[PDB]
Structure formats: structure tokens, C-alpha cells
Amino acid sequence: SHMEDFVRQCFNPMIVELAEKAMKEYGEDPKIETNKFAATCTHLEVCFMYSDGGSKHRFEIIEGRDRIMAWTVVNSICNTTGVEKPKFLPDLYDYKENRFIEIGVTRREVHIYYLEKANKIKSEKTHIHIFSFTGEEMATKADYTLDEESRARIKTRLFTIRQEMASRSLWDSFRQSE
Ligand SMILES: [Mn+2]
Ligand SMILES: [Mn+2]
Numbered sequence: 001s002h003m004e005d006f007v008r009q010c011f012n013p014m015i016v017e018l019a020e021k022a023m024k025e026y027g028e029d030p031k032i033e034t035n036k037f038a039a040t041c042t043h044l045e046v047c048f049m050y051s052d053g054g055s056k057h058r059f060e061i062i063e064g065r066d067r068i069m070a071w072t073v074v075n076s077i078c079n080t081t082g083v084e085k086p087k088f089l090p091d092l093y094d095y096k097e098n099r100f101i102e103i104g105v106t107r108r109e110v111h112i113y114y115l116e117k118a119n120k121i122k123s124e125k126t127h128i129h130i131f132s133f134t135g136e137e138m139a140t141k142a143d144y145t146l147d148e149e150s151r152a153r154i155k156t157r158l159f160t161i162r163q164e165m166a167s168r169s170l171w172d173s174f175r176q177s178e
Contacts, residue, residue: 003034003170010164011041018064019044025067035177038170039105042161046131046154047091047103053150055096063091063103074100086123094127094145101145104130105158107175110138131155133162 007030008016019040023030030037044064051059060077062070070089077093078085083100090100102121106113110132117128129139135155137144144151165171 001031001034002168003038003174004031006165006168006170007034007038007041010038010161011045015041015044015048021066022064035174038161038165038174039178042158043103043105045157046105049150049154049157050101050103050129050146051092053146058094058096059101060093060095061091062089062093062100084123084125086121086126088121090126097127097143097145099125099127101127101129104128106130106132107178108132110136114138131158133158135159 011019019037020030022040022044023033023037028036047061047063051061060073062073065073067089074085074089074093077083077100081098083098086100091103092101093099094101100123102117104113104117110130114128114130117130121128127140127143127145129137129145131137131151131154135158137151137155139145162171165174
């Protein structure tokens with residue numbers, strides 16, 4: 001599929017392999033679920049750019065691990081810090097702020113996805129940070145965790161991915177499929 005080749009020429013190879021394992025872990029095939037394939041890679045890259053901002057030992061990366069191992073770290077973070085165990089696996093834990101973070105990448109309005117992410121968690125303490133494919137962003141308590149320059153990089157990369165999909169005529173199917 002054309003989407004499949006774009007995702008392979010767009011994201012770095014380890015991001016692609018890490019997405020595949022995340023897909024195969026839930027039965028989804030990147031070769032037919034190609035739109036979900038571009039979404040998992042985009043979400044994976046944002047989480048790794050996000051942890052790249054801040055101090056060296058600031059973030060414990062929960063995403064990209066396998067479910068049992070990912071929970072193993074979450075239970076480890078909880079008993080270490082006393083923070084409540086979330087109902088769903090988050091993406092990162094902020095050692096600087098002592099809270100889990102849920103990263104979200106949207107193709108609709110950032111205000112709708114966060115509203116969609118907020119009622120699902122109900123965990124209150126879990127921080128939520130949302131980015132769009134157009135440059136906006138929305139975070140719990142208006143606390144954006146990272147500095148403006150690190151968030152500007154993520155927004156820049158998202159719009160580049162958005163442009164490259166459109167120049168290849170795959171953006172409309174990607175947008176109209178979320
Ligand atoms: Mn996740
Ligand atoms: Mn997420």
C-alpha cells in the first residue's frame with residue numbers, strides 16, 4: 001500500500017519496528033490498517049521527542065514497552081512515589097513533577113480530543129498533553145511541562161508529516177479516518 005511505503009520512508013526504522021510490535025500485540029496488521037499504522041508511528045515519535053525535552057533522567061518512558069513490562073514499571077513508579085495506579089497505561093511519568101502523562105495526537109480539534117481523553121481517565125492526577133497536526137496544543141492545568149522550544153519542535157514535525165501526506169494524496173484518507 002502507498003501509505004505503508006510512506007510511513008517507511010518517513011519515520012526512522014526503529015519507530016516503524018516498535019509500532020509493528022504494538023500493532024501485532026493487538027492483532028492489527030500495519031499492511032491493511034495503514035492509517036492506524038501512520039498514527040501509531042506519529043504517536044510513538046511524539047512521545048520520544050517529548051521525553052527528549054527536559055532533564056536527562058526526567059521522564060520514564062512507558063510507551064514503546066510491552067504491556068506486562070509497561071505495567072511493571074507503572075507499579076514500580078507507584079510504590080516508589082506513592083502516586084495512585086492509573087486505570088489505563090499512560091505514555092510517560094514525570095520524575096520532575098511526580099505524575100503520569102498521556103500524550104495525544106489529534107487530527108480534529110485539540111479541544112475535542114482532550115475532552116475525549118479526560119472522561120476516560122477519571123484519574124485526575126494523570127496529566128494530559130495533546131498536540132494537533134496543525135500547531136495547537138492543550139495540557140491539563142495549562143501546565144505544558146516542557147519549554148516552548150521543545151513543544152515547537154513537535155508541532156513543526158507534525159505539520160511536516162501533514163504536508164508530506166498531502167503531497168502524496170494520503171492526507172484526506174488519514175484525516176477522515178480517526
Ligand atoms: Mn501510550
Ligand atoms: Mn498517548
